Design a protein around this ligand. Structure first.
Ligand SMILES: CCCCCCCCCCCCCCCCCC(=O)OC[C@H](COP(=O)([O-])OCC(O)COP(=O)([O-])OC[C@@H](COC(=O)CCCCCCCCCCCCCCCCC)OC(=O)CCCCCCCCCCCCCCCCC)OC(=O)CCCCCCCCCCCCCCCCC
Ligand SMILES: CCCCCCCCCCCCCCCCCC(=O)OC[C@H](COP(=O)([O-])OCC(O)COP(=O)([O-])OC[C@@H](COC(=O)CCCCCCCCCCCCCCCCC)OC(=O)CCCCCCCCCCCCCCCCC)OC(=O)CCCCCCCCCCCCCCCCC
Ligand SMILES: CCCCCCCCCCCCCCCCCC(=O)OC[C@H](COP(=O)([O-])OCC(O)COP(=O)([O-])OC[C@@H](COC(=O)CCCCCCCCCCCCCCCCC)OC(=O)CCCCCCCCCCCCCCCCC)OC(=O)CCCCCCCCCCCCCCCCC
Ligand SMILES: CCCCCCCCCCCCCCCCCC(=O)OC[C@H](COP(=O)([O-])OCC(O)COP(=O)([O-])OC[C@@H](COC(=O)CCCCCCCCCCCCCCCCC)OC(=O)CCCCCCCCCCCCCCCCC)OC(=O)CCCCCCCCCCCCCCCCC
Ligand SMILES: CCCCCCCCCCCCCCCCCC(=O)OC[C@H](COP(=O)([O-])OCC(O)COP(=O)([O-])OC[C@@H](COC(=O)CCCCCCCCCCCCCCCCC)OC(=O)CCCCCCCCCCCCCCCCC)OC(=O)CCCCCCCCCCCCCCCCC
Ligand SMILES: CCCCCCCCCCCCCCCCCC(=O)OC[C@H](COP(=O)([O-])OCC[N+](C)(C)C)OC(=O)CCCCCCCCCCCCCCCCC
Ligand SMILES: CCCCCCCCCCCCCCCC(=O)OC[C@H](COP(=O)(O)O)OC(=O)CCCCCCCCCCCCCCC
Ligand SMILES: [K+]
Lengths: 77, 88, 113, 49, 202, 127, 212, 98
C-alpha cells in the first residue's frame, strides 16, 4: 500500500536501517501525497475544505512524529 | 548652481514630477526602516559613530554630543518613533 | 580553615566537572545514562550526515542528466571545498563556465539550426 | 572491611533473592490506564527488564 | 570592517597594557633580569599569548627563541581571533623575500634521480611523466612550505616531507583533515572515524 | 620604553592595518562640506555631483564608464595570468555565490517543512 | 638516416671502445645532416649508455642551444634525461643549463595549472598527504598571502588567510592495506635520512627529524 | 578538556552494546522460549536499552573512593597579603588545579 513517488524517494534514501532514522525523513516522505488537482473554482473550494478538515482531523488524532501509521516506511521499503 | 531659482516658488515646478522612474529601484532600500532589526542596526551604528566623534573631539573644531542637551537626545531617540510605511 | 574550605569547594567542583565530562566511560551511574546520552548524540550526528547524503542522492536521481554534472560539482564543493582554503573557487567557477559554454552552444544550435 | 561497593552488591543480591520480588507473583500492568491492561513495553524492553 | 574594529580594540588594550607595564617597571625593582624570571608564569604566559607580536616592542628582548616559538604555537593552536589579529599585524613585516632554488642543472637532476630512486611519484600523481611530477612537487613545495627556507634547506625539507608521506604506506592514501574544535569538523570526524578500521590498521 | 610605545602606535596606525580610505572617510565624516578641502573648493562636486537630489544621468554615465573599465581590466588580467591568489573578500563572495546556487537547488528539490525540520534539528545539535 | 640510427643503437648496446669512437666520429660529422629528432635521440642514447667525448658533448650542447626553440615536450624531456645522465667531465656553458632549468620549471608550472583546473582538490590533497605525518612546527607554517593588487591593496586592508592550525589528520588507505605503525614509520624515515646523508654529507635531515 | 567524546571512545561503547547482547544470550542460552534473531538489526532505542543493562564483570568489585595528598604552599609572612594571594592564585592555576 504505497505509490511510485514514495518508492522512488525510499530507493533514493539508502543506508538507513533504523525506524527512527527513517522517521527523521518523515517530512521528505510526506511529499508522496501529491494530491494533484487543477485550480478550478470548484477544485479550489474543495482543496480549502479538504485541507481544513485534514488539519482538524490531525488535531483530533494528536499522534506524534514517532507514530505515523499513514506514512509508509521501513517495513514496506 | 544658482540656488535662488530653485528657492523661487512656481506653480508648474511645484506640481511637476520630482521623482522619476530611475530613482525608485535606487531608493527603495529606504523602506527597510520599517523593520525593528534594521532600526536597531542603524541606532547601534549611529551610537558608535557618536562615541567615536566624542573620543576624537579633543581636536579643535570637532564637538561630540552632550547628554545634557534635550534636543540631541530627543532627535536621536524619536527618529524611528511612529514610523509607518503605509502612510505617505 | 578558610584555605581548607576553599580547597574542599574546589575538589567538589573538579569532581563534578570530571563526572559531567567523562561519566560515559564507566558504569558508576546505574543504567549508564551518560553513556546512552553520548550514544544518542553520536547517532543523531551520523543520522544528520546520512540525511544530507540521502537528500543529495534523491536530488541527483531526480536531476536531469544534462546538469547532473553541475549538480555533482556543486554537491562536492559544498561538502568538501567550502571549508578548505587550498580549494580555489575559481577553478569550480571555470568548470561551471565550461558547462555553460556547452549549454550555450547547444542553445544557439537549436536557435539557428 | 564492609566496603561500600561489595556491601551494595550483597544487599542487592539479598533483596532480589528474598523471594518477595519473584516475577511469578506479579501481574505487570500499565497502572495509569483506566482499564487493567498488561505491560505494553517493547519486546527488547521486556527482555532488558 | 570587523577585522578593523577588532584591531582597533586590541590596539587600545595593548597601549593600556604597555602603560601599565611601564608604570609597574618604574614602581617595582625595575630590573629586566628580575622580570625575565617570571616568563614561565601561567598568567605571564597568557599575557604574552594575548599581547605579544614580533613587530612590537612589548617584551622585545625579554623572551628567548624557544619561548617565542612556544607562545606563537599556543596562539596559533587555541586562539582564533587572536590569531586573526596577529596575522593581520604580521603584514607590517613586509618581508616578501622570494628566493629561487636549484640553480645548477646538474644538482637539480641529481636530486631528481635520488628522489625517483628512493620514492615512487606515480603514487602522488597518476598518469604523468616522472620529471613532470617532480617539477610539480617542487612547485607545490615552493608555494606552500617556502616559509622555512629562511632556516631549513629546500632539499632537506623536501626529503623530510617525502619520507614522512611514504612512511604511512608505499601506496596511494587518503588523508582527511579535521578541526574538532569546530562543530562541522567534529561531526564529520566522528562520522568518518571507525574503530574497526583502526583495529584492522586500515 | 616611551619611544617603543610611540613606535608601536605608529605601526598600529600603519597603512596595512588602518586603511588610508578609512582615514579619508573619518576626515570627511568629522568635517563639514565647507571645511572639507577636497570638496569645499570644488563647486562641481559640491553642487553638480553631491548637490543634486537626483543626478541619475551623471550616475549612469559614471557607472557605465566604471563598468567598461573594470571589464577591460578583468579581461586583460585573465588573458595574461590566472595563477595569482585573490583577495579574501572576493573569494568569500564567490564561495557564497556557489553555496547560494547549491541552496537554491536544494530548496527546489526539497520541501519547506523538511528544510525547516532539518535546520531546527541541526541547530539543536549545535547547541 | 634510419640505418645510421640503428647502427648507433647497436654499437651503444655492444659497448665497445672502438665502436664508441666510430659512433662519436660519425655523429660529430653528421650533426648538421641529422634533424632535431635524430640529434635528441642520439644524445639520449649516449647519456643512458654513459659514453661520449668531451668535444662531442660540447658540440651537442651548441646544437641544442641553437635548435632549442623547435623542441617539443618529449624532445625536451629526452634532452634533460641525457644531460642528466651525461659524463661527469661535461661542465656545460651557462646557456644550456639555463634553458633546461627554465623549460623544466615551465613544464612543472603548466602541469600544476592543468591538474588544478581539471581537479581543484589536487593541491589540497597533495598538501594534506604531505602534512599528515609532518611535524607540528611544519604544520605551524603561515597561510598563503594574496598578491593581487587594487583597492584592497592600495586604499584598503585585506585580511590574511591565516587561521587556527589545530587539526587532526585521519589517514586511510584507498586500497585497504595495513598501514605502518609509529615504530615502522620512524624506521622508514631514519633509513631514508641515512641514505640522503650518505648522498650528501651536509644534509641536516637528522636535526630536522630530531626536532619533531 | 571537553564534554564531547573522541573517536577512540566510541568503539568501546559499541563493544559494550555487543557485550550486553552476548551476555544476555549466554545467560539465557538454555531457555527454549527465547529467540535471539530479534537481537539482529536493533534500533537505536533498543541498543540504548541493552546498554542500560550492560555490565562489566572484570572491574574490581570494591569501592574506588580514595584520598590523594596535594602538598600546600605555607603562607609566607615575608611577602605580604597581595604577593601571597598572587602566589596562591598562580599555584592553584599551575599545580593544584591540573
Ligand atoms: C480587470 C479586473 C480585475 C479585478 C477583478 C478580478 C477578478 C475577480 C476576482 C476573482 C478572485 C478569485 C479568483 C477567481 C478565478 C480563479 C481562476 C482559477 O483558479 O482557475 C484555475 C486555473 C487553472 O490552473 P491549473 O489547473 O493550476 O493549471 C493551469 C495550467 O496552465 C494548465 O492549463 P492548460 O495549459 O491546459 O490550458 C488551459 C488554461 C489556459 O489558460 C491560459 O493561460 C490561457 C490564457 C488566455 C487569455 C487569458 C485572458 C482571458 C480570460 C480573462 C478572465 C475573464 C475576465 C476577467 C475580468 C473580469 C472583469 C472585466 O486554462 C485553464 O486551465 C482554465 C482557466 C480558467 C480560469 C480563469 C478564468 C477566470 C478568471 C477571471 C476571474 C473569474 C471571475 C470573473 C468575474 C467577472 C466576469 C465573469 O488557474 C489559472 O490558470 C490561474 C491564472 C491566473 C489568474 C489570475 C486572476 C484572473 C486574471 C484575469 C485577467 C484580468 C486582467 C489582468 C489584470 C487583473 C488585475 C491585476
Ligand atoms: C502558510 C501559508 C498558508 C497555508 C498554505 C497551505 C499549507 C502549507 C503547509 C502545509 C503543506 C502540506 C499540506 C498537507 C499535506 C499532507 C500531509 C500528510 O501526509 O498528512 C496526512 C496525515 C499523515 O500523518 P500520519 O501518518 O498520521 O503521521 C502522524 C505524524 O504526527 C506526522 O504528522 P504530519 O507531519 O504528517 O502532519 C500532517 C499535517 C502537516 O501539516 C501541518 O502540520 C500544518 C502546517 C500549516 C499550519 C500550521 C499551524 C501552526 C499553528 C501553531 C502556531 C501559531 C498559530 C497562531 C495563529 C494565530 C491566528 C489564528 O497535515 C495537515 O494538517 C495539513 C493541513 C493543511 C492546511 C493548513 C491550514 C489549516 C487552517 C485551520 C484553521 C483552524 C480551523 C478552522 C477555524 C476554527 C476557528 C473558527 O494523516 C493522514 O494521512 C490522514 C488520513 C485520513 C484518515 C485519518 C483518520 C484519523 C482518525 C483515526 C486514527 C486512527 C487510525 C487507525 C489506528 C492506527 C493505524 C492502524
Ligand atoms: C553573507 C551575506 C552576504 C550578502 C551580500 C549582499 C548584500 C546585499 C544587501 C542586502 C540588504 C538586506 C537588508 C535587509 C535584510 C533584513 C530585513 C529584515 O529586517 O527582515 C527580517 C524581519 C525583521 O523582523 P521585525 O519586523 O523587525 O520584527 C518585529 C518584532 O518582532 C516586533 O514584534 P512585536 O513584539 O511588536 O509583536 C510581534 C511579537 C510576536 O507576537 C506574535 O505572536 C505576533 C503574531 C502576529 C499574527 C500571526 C498570524 C499567523 C497566522 C498566519 C497569518 C495570518 C494573516 C495575518 C498576518 C499578519 C502579519 C503577521 O514579536 C515578539 O515580541 C517576538 C519576540 C522577538 C524575538 C523572537 C524573534 C522571532 C522571529 C520573528 C517573528 C516571530 C513570529 C512569531 C509568531 C507567533 C508564533 C507562535 O523578520 C521578519 O520578517 C520576521 C521573521 C522571518 C519570518 C519568515 C516567514 C517565512 C514564511 C513562513 C511560512 C510558514 C509559516 C506561516 C505561519 C507562521 C508560523 C506558525
Ligand atoms: C561599530 C563601530 C562603528 C564606528 C564608526 C566610526 C566612523 C568610521 C567608520 C569606519 C569604517 C567605514 C569606512 C571605511 C571602510 C573601509 C573598508 C575596507 O577598505 O576594508 C576592506 C574590507 C576587506 O575585508 P576583510 O577585512 O578581508 O574581511 C573579509 C570579509 O568578508 C569582509 O567582512 P568583515 O568580516 O571584514 O566585516 C565587515 C562586514 C560586516 O562587519 C561588521 O558588521 C562591521 C562591524 C563594525 C566594524 C567597525 C570598524 C571601524 C571602527 C572605527 C571606529 C574606531 C574608534 C576607535 C577609537 C575609540 C572608540 C571607543 O561587512 C560586510 O561585508 C557586510 C556585507 C553585507 C551587508 C550587511 C549589512 C546589511 C544586512 C544584510 C543582511 C542579509 C542577510 C540575508 C538576507 C536576509 C533577508 C531577510 O572590505 C570589506 O569588508 C567590504 C565591506 C563591504 C560592505 C560594507 C558596507 C555594509 C555594512 C558593513 C557593516 C556595518 C557597518 C557599516 C559602517 C558603519 C559606520 C558607523
Ligand atoms: C557601590 C559602588 C558600585 C560598584 C559595586 C561595589 C564594588 C565594591 C568593590 C569592593 C572591592 C574590595 C577589595 C578589597 C581588597 C582587599 C585586599 C587586601 O587583602 O587588603 C590587604 C592589603 C595589604 O597590602 P599588601 O598586600 O600587604 O601590600 C602592601 C605592601 O607593603 C607593598 O607590597 P609591594 O610593594 O611588594 O607590592 C605591592 C605594590 C606594588 O605596586 C603596585 O602594584 C601599585 C599599583 C597601583 C595602581 C597602578 C595603576 C594606576 C592607574 C589607576 C587605576 C586604574 C585601574 C587599573 C589597575 C591595575 C592594577 C593595579 O602595590 C601595593 O602597594 C598594593 C596596594 C595598592 C593600593 C593602591 C591602589 C588603590 C586603588 C586601585 C585602583 C582602584 C580602581 C580605580 C578605578 C578608577 C577610579 C577613577 O591592603 C592594601 O594595602 C590595599 C587595600 C586596597 C583596598 C581597596 C578597596 C576598594 C574599595 C572601593 C572600590 C571602588 C573603587 C572606585 C571604583 C568604583 C567603580 C564603580
Ligand atoms: C493584506 C493581505 C492579507 C492577506 C491574508 C490572506 C490570508 C488567507 C488565509 C487562508 C487560509 C485557508 C486555510 C484552508 C486551506 C487552504 C488551502 C490550502 O491548504 O492551500 C494549499 C492548496 C493546495 O495546493 P497544492 O495542491 O499545490 O499543495 C502543494 C502541496 N502538496 C504537494 C502536498 C499538495 O493550495 C491551493 O489550492 C492554492 C492556494 C492559494 C490560493 C490563493 C487564492 C487567492 C488569494 C487572494 C488573497 C487572500 C484572500 C483575500 C484576503 C483579503 C483580506 C482583506
Ligand atoms: C563622468 C563621471 C562624473 C562623476 C565622477 C566622480 C563621481 C564620484 C562619486 C560617485 C557618484 C555619487 C553620486 C551621489 C549623489 C547621487 O547619486 O544623488 C542622487 C541620489 C541622492 O539620494 P537621496 O535623494 O536619498 O539623497 O542618489 C541615490 O539615490 C543613490 C545612488 C547611488 C549614489 C552613490 C554611488 C553608488 C555607486 C554608483 C554605481 C552603482 C549604480 C548606480 C545606479 C546606476
Ligand atoms: K569527554
Amino acid at each position: 500500500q504505497t505509490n511510485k513517488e514514495w518508492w522512488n524517494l525510499a530507493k533514493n534514501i539508502q543506508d538507513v536501517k533504523c525506524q527512527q532514522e527513517l522517521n527523521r525523513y518523515n517530512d521528505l516522505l510526506s511529499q508522496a501525497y501529491t494530491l494533484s488537482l487543477d485550480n478550478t473554482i470548484r477544485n479550489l473550494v474543495f482543496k480549502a475544505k479538504f485541507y481544513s478538515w485534514l488539519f482538524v482531523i490531525n488535531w483530533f488524532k494528536a499522534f506524534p512524529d514517532d507514530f505515523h501509521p499513514f506514512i509508509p516506511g521501513l517495513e514496506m521499503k | 548652481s544658482d540656488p535662488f531659482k530653485k528657492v523661487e516658488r512656481d506653480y508648474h515646478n511645484e506640481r511637476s514630477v520630482h521623482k522619476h522612474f530611475a530613482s525608485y529601484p535606487l531608493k527603495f532600500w529606504w523602506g527597510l526602516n520599517k523593520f525593528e532589526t534594521i532600526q536597531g542596526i542603524h541606532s547601534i551604528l549611529g551610537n558608535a559613530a557618536d562615541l567615536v566623534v566624542s573620543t576624537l573631539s579633543f581636536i579643535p573644531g570637532v564637538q561630540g554630543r552632550n547628554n545634557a542637551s534635550y534636543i540631541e537626545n530627543s532627535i536621536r531617540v524619536t527618529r524611528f518613533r511612529g514610523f509607518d510605511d503605509k502612510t505617505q | 580553615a578558610i584555605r581548607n574550605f576553599v580547597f574542599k569547594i574546589s575538589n567538589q567542583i573538579q569532581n563534578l566537572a570530571a563526572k559531567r565530562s567523562l561519566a560515559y566511560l564507566n558504569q558508576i551511574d546505574s543504567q549508564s545514562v551518560p553513556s546512552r546520552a553520548t550514544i544518542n548524540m553520536k547517532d543523531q550526528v551520523t543520522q544528520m550526515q546520512r540525511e544530507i547524503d540521502n537528500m543529495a542522492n534523491v536530488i541527483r536521481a531526480q536531476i536531469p542528466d544534462e546538469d547532473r554534472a553541475e549538480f555533482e560539482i556543486l554537491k562536492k564543493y559544498y561538502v568538501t571545498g567550502q571549508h578548505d582554503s587550498l580549494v580555489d573557487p575559481q577553478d569550480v567557477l571555470l568548470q561551471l563556465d565550461r558547462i555553460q559554454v556547452l549549454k550555450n552552444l547547444k542553445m544557439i544550435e537549436l536557435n539557428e539550426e | 572491611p564492609e566496603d561500600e561497593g561489595i556491601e551494595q552488591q550483597l544487599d542487592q543480591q539479598e533483596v532480589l533473592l528474598s523471594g518477595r520480588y519473584d516475577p511469578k507473583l506479579y501481574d505487570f500492568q500499565e497502572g495509569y490506564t483506566k482499564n487493567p491492561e498488561d505491560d505494553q513495553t517493547s519486546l527488547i524492553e521486556k527482555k532488558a527488564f | 570592517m570587523t577585522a578593523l574594529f577588532l584591531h582597533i580594540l586590541w590596539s587600545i588594550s595593548y597601549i593600556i597594557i604597555n602603560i601599565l607595564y611601564i608604570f609597574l617597571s618604574l614602581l617595582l625593582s625595575n630590573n629586566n633580569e628580575k622580570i625575565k624570571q617570571y616568563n614561565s608564569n601561567y598568567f605571564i604566559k597568557i599575557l604574552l599569548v594575548l599581547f605579544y607580536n614580533k613587530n612590537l616592542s612589548f617584551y622585545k628582548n625579554l623572551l628567548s627563541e624557544d619561548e617565542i616559538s612556544k607562545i606563537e604555537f599556543e596562539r596559533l593552536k587555541n586562539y582564533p581571533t587572536l590569531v586573526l589579529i596577529h596575522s593581520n599585524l604580521n603584514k607590517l613585516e613586509k618581508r616578501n623575500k622570494i628566493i629561487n632554488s636549484f640553480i645548477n642543472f646538474k644538482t637539480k637532476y641529481r636530486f631528481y634521480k635520488f628522489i625517483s630512486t628512493n620514492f615512487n611519484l606515480q603514487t602522488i600523481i597518476k598518469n604523468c611523466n616522472d620529471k613532470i611530477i617532480f617539477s610539480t612537487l617542487l612547485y607545490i613545495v615552493n608555494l606552500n612550505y617556502s616559509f622555512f627556507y629562511k632556516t631549513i634547506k629546500n632539499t632537506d625539507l623536501i626529503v623530510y616531507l617525502l619520507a614522512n608521506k611514504f612512511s604511512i604506506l608505499n601506496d596511494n592514501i587518503i588523508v582527511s583533515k579535521f578541526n574538532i574544535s569546530k562543530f562541522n569538523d567534529y561531526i564529520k570526524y566522528i562520522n568518518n572515524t571507525n574503530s574497526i578500521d583502526t583495529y584492522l590498521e586500515n | 620604553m616611551f619611544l617603543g610605545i610611540f613606535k608601536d602606535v605608529i605601526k598600529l596606525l600603519n597603512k596595512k592595518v588602518v586603511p588610508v580610505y578609512f582615514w579619508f572617510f573619518l576626515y570627511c565624516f568629522l568635517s563639514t562640506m565647507d571645511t572639507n578641502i577636497f570638496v569645499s573648493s570644488c563647486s562641481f562636486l559640491k553642487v553638480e555631483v553631491f548637490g543634486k537630489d537626483e543626478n541619475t544621468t551623471l550616475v549612469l554615465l559614471f557607472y557605465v564608464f566604471y563598468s567598461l573599465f573594470n571589464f577591460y581590466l578583468s579581461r586583460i588580467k585573465n588573458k595574461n595570468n590566472y595563477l595569482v591568489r585573490k583577495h579574501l573578500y572576493t573569494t568569500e563572495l564567490l564561495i557564497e555565490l556557489i553555496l547560494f546556487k547549491y541552496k537554491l537547488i536544494i530548496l527546489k528539490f526539497s520541501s519547506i517543512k523538511y528544510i525547516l525540520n532539518f535546520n531546527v534539528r541541526k541547530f539543536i545539535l549545535f547547541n | 638516416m634510419s640505418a645510421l640510427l640503428k647502427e648507433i643503437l647497436a654499437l651503444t648496446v655492444k659497448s665497445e671502445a672502438a665502436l664508441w669512437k666510430g659512433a662519436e666520429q660519425k655523429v660529430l660529422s653528421g650533426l648538421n645532416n641529422l634533424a632535431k629528432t635524430e640529434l635528441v635521440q642520439i644524445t639520449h642514447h649516449f647519456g643512458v649508455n654513459k659514453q661520449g667525448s668531451e668535444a662531442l658533448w660540447s658540440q651537442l650542447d651548441k646544437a641544442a642551444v641553437g635548435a632549442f626553440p623547435e623542441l617539443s615536450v618529449d624532445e625536451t624531456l629526452q634532452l634533460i634525461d641525457g644531460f642528466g645522465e651525461c659524463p661527469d667531465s661535461y661542465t656545460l656553458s651557462h646557456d644550456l643549463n639555463q634553458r633546461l632549468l627554465v623549460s623544466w620549471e615551465q613544464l612543472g608550472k603548466l602541469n600544476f595549472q592543468k591538474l588544478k583546473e581539471t581537479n581543484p582538490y589536487f593541491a589540497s590533497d597533495i598538501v594534506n598527504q604531505l602534512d599528515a605525518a609532518a611535524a607540528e612546527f611544519i604544520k605551524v607554517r603561515p597561510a598563503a598571502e594574496s598578491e593581487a593588487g587594487g583597492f584592497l591593496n592600495s586604499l584598503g586592508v585585506s585580511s590574511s588567510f591565516n587561521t587556527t592550525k589545530n587539526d587532526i589528520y585521519v589517514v586511510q588507505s584507498a586500497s585497504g592495506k595495513k598501514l605502518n605503525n609509529k615504530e615502522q614509520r620512524e624506521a622508514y624515515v631514519l633509513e631514508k635520512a641515512q641514505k640522503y646523508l650518505k648522498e650528501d654529507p651536509q644534509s641536516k635531515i637528522l636535526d630536522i627529524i630530531a626536532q619533531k | 578538556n571537553s564534554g564531547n567524546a573522541l573517536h577512540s571512545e566510541y568503539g568501546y561503547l559499541e563493544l559494550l552494546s555487543n557485550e550486553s547482547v552476548q551476555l544476555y544470550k549466554d545467560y539465557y542460552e538454555s531457555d527454549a522460549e527465547e529467540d535471539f534473531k530479534v537481537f539482529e538489526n536493533l534500533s537505536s532505542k533498543e541498543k540504548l536499552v541493552m546498554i542500560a543493562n550492560f555490565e562489566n564483570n572484570l572491574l574490581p568489585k570494591y569501592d574506588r573512593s580514595e584520598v590523594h595528598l596535594i602538598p600546600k604552599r605555607q603562607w609566607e609572612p615575608a611577602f605580604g597579603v597581595w604577593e601571597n594571594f598572587l602566589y596562591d592564585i598562580t599555584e592553584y592555576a599551575s599545580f593544584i588545579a591540573p
